Amino acid sequence: MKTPITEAIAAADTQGRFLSNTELQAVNGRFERAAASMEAARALTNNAQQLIDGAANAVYQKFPYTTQMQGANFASDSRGKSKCARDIGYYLRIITYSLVAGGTGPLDEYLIAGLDEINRTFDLSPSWYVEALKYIKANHGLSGQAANEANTYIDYAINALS
Amino acid sequence: MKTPITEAIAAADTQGRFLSNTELQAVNGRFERAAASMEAARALTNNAQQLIDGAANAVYQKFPYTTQMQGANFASDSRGKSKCARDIGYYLRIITYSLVAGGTGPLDEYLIAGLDEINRTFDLSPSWYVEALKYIKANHGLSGQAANEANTYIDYAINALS
Amino acid sequence: MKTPITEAIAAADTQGRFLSNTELQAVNGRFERAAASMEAARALTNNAQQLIDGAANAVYQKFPYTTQMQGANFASDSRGKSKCARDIGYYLRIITYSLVAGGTGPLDEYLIAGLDEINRTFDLSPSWYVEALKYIKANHGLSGQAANEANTYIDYAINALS
Amino acid sequence: MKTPITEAIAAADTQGRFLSNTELQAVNGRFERAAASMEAARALTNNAQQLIDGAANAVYQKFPYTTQMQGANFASDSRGKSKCARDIGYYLRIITYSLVAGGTGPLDEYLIAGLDEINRTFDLSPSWYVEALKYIKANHGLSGQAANEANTYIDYAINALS
Amino acid sequence: MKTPITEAIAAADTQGRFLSNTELQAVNGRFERAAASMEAARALTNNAQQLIDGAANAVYQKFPYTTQMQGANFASDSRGKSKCARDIGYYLRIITYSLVAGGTGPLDEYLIAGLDEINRTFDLSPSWYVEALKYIKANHGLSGQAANEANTYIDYAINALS
Amino acid sequence: MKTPITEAIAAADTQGRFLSNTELQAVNGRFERAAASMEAARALTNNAQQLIDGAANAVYQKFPYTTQMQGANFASDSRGKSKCARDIGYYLRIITYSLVAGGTGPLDEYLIAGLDEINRTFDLSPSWYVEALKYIKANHGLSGQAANEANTYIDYAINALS
Amino acid sequence: MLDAFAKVVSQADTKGEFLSSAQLDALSNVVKDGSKRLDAVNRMTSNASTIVANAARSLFEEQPQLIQPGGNAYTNRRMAACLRDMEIILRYVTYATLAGDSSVLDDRCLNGLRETYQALGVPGGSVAAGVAKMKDAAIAIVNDPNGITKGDCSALVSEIASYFDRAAAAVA
Amino acid sequence: MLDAFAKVVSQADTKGEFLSSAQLDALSNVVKDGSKRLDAVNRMTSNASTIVANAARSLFEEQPQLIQPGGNAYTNRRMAACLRDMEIILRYVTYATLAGDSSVLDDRCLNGLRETYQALGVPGGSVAAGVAKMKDAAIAIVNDPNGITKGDCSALVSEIASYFDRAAAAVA
Amino acid sequence: MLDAFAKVVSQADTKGEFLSSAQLDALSNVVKDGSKRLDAVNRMTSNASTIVANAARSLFEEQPQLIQPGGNAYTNRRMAACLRDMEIILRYVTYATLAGDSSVLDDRCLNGLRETYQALGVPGGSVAAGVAKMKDAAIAIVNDPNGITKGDCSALVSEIASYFDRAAAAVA
Amino acid sequence: MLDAFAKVVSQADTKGEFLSSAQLDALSNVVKDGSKRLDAVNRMTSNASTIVANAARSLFEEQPQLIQPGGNAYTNRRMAACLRDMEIILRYVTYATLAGDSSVLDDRCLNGLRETYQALGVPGGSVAAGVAKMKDAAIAIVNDPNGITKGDCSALVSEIASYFDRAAAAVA
Amino acid sequence: MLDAFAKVVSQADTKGEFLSSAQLDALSNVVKDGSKRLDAVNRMTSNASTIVANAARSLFEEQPQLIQPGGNAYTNRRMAACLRDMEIILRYVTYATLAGDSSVLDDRCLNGLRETYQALGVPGGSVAAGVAKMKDAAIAIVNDPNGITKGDCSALVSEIASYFDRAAAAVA
Amino acid sequence: MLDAFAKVVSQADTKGEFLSSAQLDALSNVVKDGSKRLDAVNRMTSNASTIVANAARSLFEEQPQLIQPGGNAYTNRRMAACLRDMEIILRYVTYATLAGDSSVLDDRCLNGLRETYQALGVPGGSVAAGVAKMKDAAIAIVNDPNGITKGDCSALVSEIASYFDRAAAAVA
Ligand SMILES: *[C@@H](C)[C@H]1/C(=C/c2[nH]c(/C=C3N=C(/C=C4\NC(=O)C(CC)=C4C)C(C)=C\3CCC(=O)O)c(CCC(=O)O)c2C)NC(=O)[C@@H]1C
């Protein structure tokens, strides 16, 4: 899993060498940033249900056909609404994982790898999830560098869908 | 040249990726460490001639044959003494480069690559340069993290000679 | 470009051999089938404008939000409707090329390669183009093996979008 | 084994794709040619002993030394005559296999691979087998496309010996 | 060109190392064999025309169909007899080159590479050349180790034809 | 193990071919040289202990600091003197192996591979062993090509240390 | 790889025999029914995306443990691998249908697949359930009389079903 | 490649000299301004998809000959290549921004690109127009006073603009 | 590579146009003469060994300096390479004949062959003479009325001759 | 590989759960003690040559059969391989110390090492003895109170000791 | 690989011993008989084609089931492989004869060959019968008193026979 | 590559001629002087380290700008490359001496080296000066009358000198 620590070790290991002071500085940078990352993770976790429900309603109001049209890929029935809220919770949960790990590893491994294939196969529009992520960005209530950390990983997911 | 910044870019470029916060945290780690690194670099530079002259004397006293035996690899004449003091100055100067760059890049590129070949070809004993480096470590007069920085790169050079 | 003839030649060339009856039989099969393929290509060409405009309006009727929602990816203005009719004409024209060439080469090279990347970047829904292709399949007016030829390449494009 | 059908599947499989109409036309071409190929196969099979005996006689008359010189590679005794008639029967039988399979596969796998090695090792002259094949071509009694099919595979064997 | 000297150099060069006594011994072995090799080379050269004429006549005597049968590959006319005597002279000349060079290099490069292809393409029987070589072995008049040298390269060519 | 015989076999085996006269001459060169090589091996073996004792004393006399300086890498106590005489005996014994095998194989495999790593890791100076080898060259008492054989392999080890 | 014709040829070569009149008759009937075989392959291929997607969806509805967190098909990378496997098996079934012989399916797809799934922890029994769903959908598509010249495809349908069943048995 | 620190070190080594007190002061100032540099890289990276897509869309609106049939960016494969080139140039510009030195952009992206485009027939002048559009969008994003501590980034912005201008000049 | 059909399609795509009735009629004529085209390929292929060997023999008879010691085709290795080149050129000419387009011959055989021959010292003019001999033999074989349904292959023969001439011109 | 943070994430994802307040508090303590962890890695790395050499020397003193002729570490090539193994194990122990997790050590160094040693004839029990000597030396270096801010590193030291013990148990 | 000299050296090195005067005398006798050894290798090599062909012919005469249709050496591809195996085994026997040691034959030819044949279905007992025929022919050629200085080669002939017997035992 | 014998053979084959009695005599003289040639190669090889080291030391003493900071041989990596080039050229000179022909030196060392040095910025004139120093040392070693049977090696020394001069001219 990609974290600043595993990335430093992989760099040294590729080269058959001990960790050098370059890699140790990188890990200390991760330790100093962790206070902001963990503040964001706690706030997103504590408000997770409201963020998920609000994000889903944002998508339904931006794309009202998703609650109107018949289809296994749509949220016009309880099955589809449950699928959608589930997916949005996956995004939020794995974003908090990335904040805790200090890198994109969790998003890369658990969600982004295979993302395009899944959206094509099940006819899910990436624009739906971009809108959900924009809602979370606008409503997490963070400021300072904790907001910077949350927005960086939200924007990372948006770019993967764009 | 291997620095924390070029190492961050190389990691992203190998994967065809934009930089992520995994790498930006690494670079901020280098920024936070720079104050200690630059304090060490300034002290070693300001006292360079005295460190070089003292280190050379320390080697001559530990290995008296190096000022007596008349081969080209020894310092029995002014030519060999000038070569030796030059070499020790190279070590000290490139150590300050590594402190300023924030990584082993300068030592790796300018000195350590080919080092074993050169010491074998010209019949130079690695133990001579280890003794010079131990003198520098014992006499740079630093404390705190500035000494940590200086000693880390001195020890890096000693390990390359061992 | 992949045709039954170029595939036959490529098969022999990869093995550094002359063509055998194994490949000449395949090319004769292509010659036999050309009557059905060309009947389809002529009918689609002769009715192209009617099919293109009908297919575009079939998309607008299935997905009315594409004519309501504002944004560069939608057909709520004259610019967007012209883009959409243009795209559908591209599909139909390149399908006729595939019929004439007797293979998927034209669709593979001119349209399908890069298709997923383009739909993601420009926020275009594959379901829109599937619906246009379904309309063309339902309205080309062909029968027999000419209809089989037309539908095989239409379905090939639908699967590439799915 | 190389047939028009296995070639079609191999082409799709090497590209990791479903069969397309490009390959199905190839297989239909094989189906349409089968009538002529099977007609030739039956005619050669039902006249096989007469063709084999006549071909062997044709070789012995063209190359009289083969029935006189007493080495193991020649047919001066019943042992060598039996080997020779056996070999000619191998050619004819495997030619009928190629007609039935619709491709050179049986000739390539059962006879031609290793052929040069064997003729060199056992000191057998390719010209002997060319003459036997020329006899079969001159005496199969076929017409039309059945003759074309038989002659194509006989000529394929002649080229492998030349 | 493969000689004991060029293989010694190639062995060192493949390994990026200076020549050792491992290779110098090989070259001295070539020097000590040269007395026998050159004795053979001078005798074959001094008797070349009589050996070539006798070998050609020996081939025709063993295989008299070669002076009887019509065809560009046979010696039934002045043109074919000149081709045959020319070929046999090539064998003898290049055998003397191999004796002089101390290795199979000249035979390998000038004659054996592509030999099988040529005999097949032009319908030349390897057995003809084997008989020419057997005549030369039986009539070069050499004794002792000079005969051993000549017969070793003659047998080398016979094996290349078998 | 590299000998003139295994090199000859390796050359043939790399090309998948029988041994040729090119290689048999090389092996005879090894057989002829063995008279000198084995004479050298017997003389070094018969005088092995006097040569080892004398070489060790010659190293100490040239580099008397090795009997004086404290450290595990020096011969300033009984343990270090025993290690040094052991090492010198290894060099002499493996030199006799190379003479017996007619090649550098034993020196390459038993001593030279990893030599630089060991001298660096254990802080052993190559110049010490060069002086031991120069003593052996000056004192083996051989003449003629037997002396040439001994001195060639002694010089081979000296070059490996230089 | 063998097709129906190469299989009979290979058997006859092992006995050193010309093909018999009955063996030739049987291969001529393969040619006679060849148009129906081409339709069957075209129809499965032309519907491959929906065959895979509908079978996968139904499998996950019946077996939600496959897609809950910790499940074998949870995360998009593992779901993508699962959908790929369904498409791969369908692809090689269509290859075997064109060939009239299972050798390509056995040799390039099924041989070693059970061992591969066991090393990975893929539930082979659940894969077999998905394969059976693709079978039922593909057969319904092949054997639909609309939009095709009417005739009997029952022997071809049984052959195709046997290839699906062979794939399911290779992983269950 | 070189960053801002390796750049000074390499020049000093060629002269065989320790860094001067003034050179250390200048490098210390690079460190002090480092947080703003990280913001600029993060902001450009976090908006990469829209920077590329909006610039590409505007380029094609202004130059419809690029996308009409026969145009260099016609067909989805060539359009995908064109979009990829835009993203590549932006990517290497953000690398240069992190390094504070253009070497990674020159050595790994721009060197030989004009000759590559000439062999292909890619209109380099049109690429340069697209690069200029990405520049304007990226600078506006970096300069946005919302959601960041207010301060002076004008030197950084001029440096970033110079990297974009360097890329456009390499292909025009 | 292109065949006759792909060539017309490629030209139409560059213009963004459907094929015209005249273009479709022309391609229908390629189909209508397809059986003759298959005969031409089968006949050249079935006589490939004699076409090459007879042409090489005649070339060396006219140009003995090619095979005398020191000649370009002297030694069996160089003679084998020379015979191989004749076979290669004939092979790609038969490919172009099947395709009804010279692109495969131009792209995979003739492009850069002159420069290859100049670097090696192969006499390209002598290669061209051998190619012309293969042309004359192949045309006589293709256009032999024995053992074939009688008809007019003159247009096909002219096309085949143009491919041989194109090969000879690429090396002369 | 996993570090201490990735390990907790991986377990939470398998359960489909957000991290609890307690799990976040625990990881914040890993960060709080991070400077000590960096000191431990730096101190072991900065003394790696002497840690390896002193342990190897002591091992050969206790087990002279390893270096006598016919011994597993006799000849300079096998001695160099033995020294390399000691360095490799120490290197991966320092990796695990930085990560706060043994996974990189287990996955890349220890897994399969016993069977490798058995195939080669390397005495793994003797390797384990060397590893234990490196452990004792490394711990004394990490615990050295000179030249460092005074504090408690006992939990860190126990963690490092467990990595050494894990390596020795994997080869014995 | 080892030759006769390297084998003694390797055994001595394992014991840390100089070669004894008796070991040196034994190797001097290998040198003394070296000319006879070279003749034996030259004679087998110079007759390699007939040794292989005559042994194969005799084997197939005695075991016609090997070449009848369905037999392991039926078809020219399998016959070529069989003849190749005979040549390979003879080749490595001549290598061992030059070396005075079986290591090259064991390491590069015989080790794993039984298992290779068993996986393929090659009848190893029949290969062993072919090897024994090559042995008898090769020994008769080596022992031929014509055209050579008369002397005793019995020890060398026994050694050569032992290598052939080793190969036959490795595949039976 | 060619040795002295292969060069004469190659020239004769180009003319299709047997070697003349004078050419055989000349090659017999190469054999006659072979012992001296072996001594020359052994002597240069046995002193290779000092030949390279002494020539490099003298070159740097005469041209200090090569090793001062900024110089082409400054830093240990470039110095190692420079020493390697000296050893490479000496190695190929000894090869040419063994072969009695410069072809291996020209083909594998000298051809294209001048262009290599110009692209890198290596001062070829300084390399030539180092090569001439190796020449003088190697010649003195070859002509040293101590420890060798006394005789005339003047023609061999002139040949060796010509190879060194050839290398120096190739880089200057
Ligand atoms: C010009 C680009 C705009 C701007 C820049 C600006 N930023 C800051 C202050 C901070 N920026 C950061 C960002 C990071 N630190 C890291 O380690 C990482 C990677 C994970 C990032 C992205 C931080 C931590 C600070 C300090 C805390 C804070 O929020 O202030 C400043 C302040 C001056 C300074 O150098 O600290 C400025 C000026 N401000 C503008 O107005 C421009 C639009």
Residue numbers in the entry:
A (entry chain K), B (entry chain I), C (entry chain G), D (entry chain E), E (entry chain C), F (entry chain A): 1 to 162
G (entry chain F), H (entry chain J), I (entry chain H), J (entry chain L), K (entry chain B), L (entry chain D): 1 to 172
Pull verbatim passages from the article behind this deposition.
C-phycocyanin (CPC), a blue pigment protein, is an indispensable component of giant phycobilisomes, which are light-harvesting antenna complexes in cyanobacteria that transfer energy efficiently to photosystems I and II. X-ray crystallographic analyses and EM analyses of CPCs have revealed that the quaternary structure of CPC is a closed toroidal (αβ)6 hexamer with D3 symmetry that is thought to be formed by assembling two trimers face-to-face. In the present study, the native CPC from O-77, namely TlCPC, was isolated and its oligomeric states were determined using X-ray crystallographic and cryo-EM analyses. These structural analyses unexpectedly revealed the coexistence of conventional hexameric (αβ)6 (TlCPC-6) and novel octameric (αβ)8 (TlCPC-8) states, even though TlCPC-6 and TlCPC-8 possessed the same amino acid sequences; notably, PBPs with C4 or D4 symmetries have not previously been reported.
TlCPC crystallized in the primitive orthorhombic P21212 was further refined and then the hexameric structure (TlCPC-6) with D3 symmetry was determined at a resolution of 1.65 Å, where the asymmetric unit contained a hexamer. The X-ray crystallographic analysis of TlCPC-6 showed that phycocyanobilins (PCBs), i.e., the chromophores in CPCs, were covalently bonded at the conserved Cys residues of αCys84 (α84PCB), βCys82 (β82PCB), and βCys153 (β153PCB). Although TlCPC-6 was also crystallized in the primitive orthorhombic space group (P21212), hexameric CPCs were orientationally aligned in the crystal. In TlCPC-6, the buried surface area between hexamers along the C3 axis, as calculated by the PISA program, was 609 Å2 per hexamer, which indicated weak interactions similar to layered CPCs in the rods of PBS. In TlCPC-6, the distances of intraprotein PCB pairs were as follows: α84PCB–β82PCB (20.0 Å), β153PCB–β153PCB (25.8 Å), and α84PCB–α84PCB (26.9 Å). Additionally, the distances of interprotein PCB pairs were as follows: β82PCB–β82PCB (26.2 Å) and α84PCB–α84PCB (34.4 Å). These values were close to those of the reported CPCs, indicating that the estimated main energy pathways between hexamers were via α84PCB and β82PCB. The dihedral angle of the (αβ) monomer (αGln70–αArg30–βGly70) in TlCPC-6 was approximately 110°, whereas the equivalent angle in TlCPC-8 was approximately 123°.
